[PDB]
């Protein structure tokens, strides 16, 4: 499913993402926007290392979820990567939270550094009632 901007903002807020490990909702919005365009079905195969990025936050199979086909991969979120392809994003959010509990925090996603860090991300949550 492709979420509408404010629909996603409130969906993430209800799932407890607002200020999680000090990360604002607008930061998460910017991340989902640049990672998948708010598409829970988004997928990207990385031919270089044989891994795949899954769902709305494009979480990688090498370390976070298990798809059974990534060489020497781990499953830190303890989830089948299929769970990251559901319209319901509760599991993807649980995993995104797991990712940010590590040292890097939101910096785990290079796209956040590229397109959200030190950027004006207000626009992502304006008018959403969050």
Curated annotation (Swiss-Prot):
Alphabetically, the GO molecular function entries are: identical protein binding; lysozyme activity
Mind naming one GO cellular-component term on file for this protein?
A: extracellular region
Q: Which UniProt keywords apply?
A: Amyloid, Amyloidosis, Antimicrobial, Bacteriolytic enzyme, Disease variant, Disulfide bond, Glycosidase, Hydrolase, Secreted, Signal
Give the GO terms filed under biological process for this record.
Answer: antimicrobial humoral response; defense response to bacterium; defense response to Gram-negative bacterium; defense response to Gram-positive bacterium; inflammatory response; killing of cells of another organism
| Its EC number(s) | 3.2.1.17
One Pfam short name? Lys
The record's PROSITE patterns line, in alphabetical order, gives: GLYCOSYL_HYDROL_F22_1, GLYCOSYL_HYDROL_F22_2
Domain C-type lysozyme: residue ranges? 1-130
Q: Does the keyword Ligase apply?
A: no
EC top class, as a word: hydrolase
Tell me, in one coarse class, where this protein mainly resides.
secreted
Disulfide bond as a keyword of this entry, yes or no, is: yes
**Disulfide bridges in this chain:** 6-128, 30-116, 65-81, 77-95
Subunit text: Monomer.
Q: Which family does it belong to?
A: Belongs to the glycosyl hydrolase 22 family.
Function (record text): Lysozymes have primarily a bacteriolytic function; those in tissues and body fluids are associated with the monocyte-macrophage system and enhance the activity of immunoagents.
UniProt xrefs under PANTHER family: LYSOZYME C (PTHR11407:SF28)
Listed name of the protein: Lysozyme C
């Amino acid at each position: 499913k492709y979420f509408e901007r404010c629909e996603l903002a409130r969906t993430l807020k209800r799932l407890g993402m607002d200020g999680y490990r000090g990360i604002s909702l607008a930061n998460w919005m910017c991340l989902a926007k640049w990672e998948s365009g708010y598409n829970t079905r988004a997928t990207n195969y990385n031919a270089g290392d044989r891994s795949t990025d899954y769902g709305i936050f494009q979480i990688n199979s090498r370390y976070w979820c298990n798809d059974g086909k990534t060489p020497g991969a781990v499953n830190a979120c303890h989830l089948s990567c299929s769970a990251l392809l559901q319209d319901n994003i509760a599991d993807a959010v649980a995993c995104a939270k797991r990712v940010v509990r590590d040292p890097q925090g939101i910096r785990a996603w290079v796209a956040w550094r590229n397109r959200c860090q030190n950027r004006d991300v207000r626009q992502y949550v304006q008018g959403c009632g969050v």
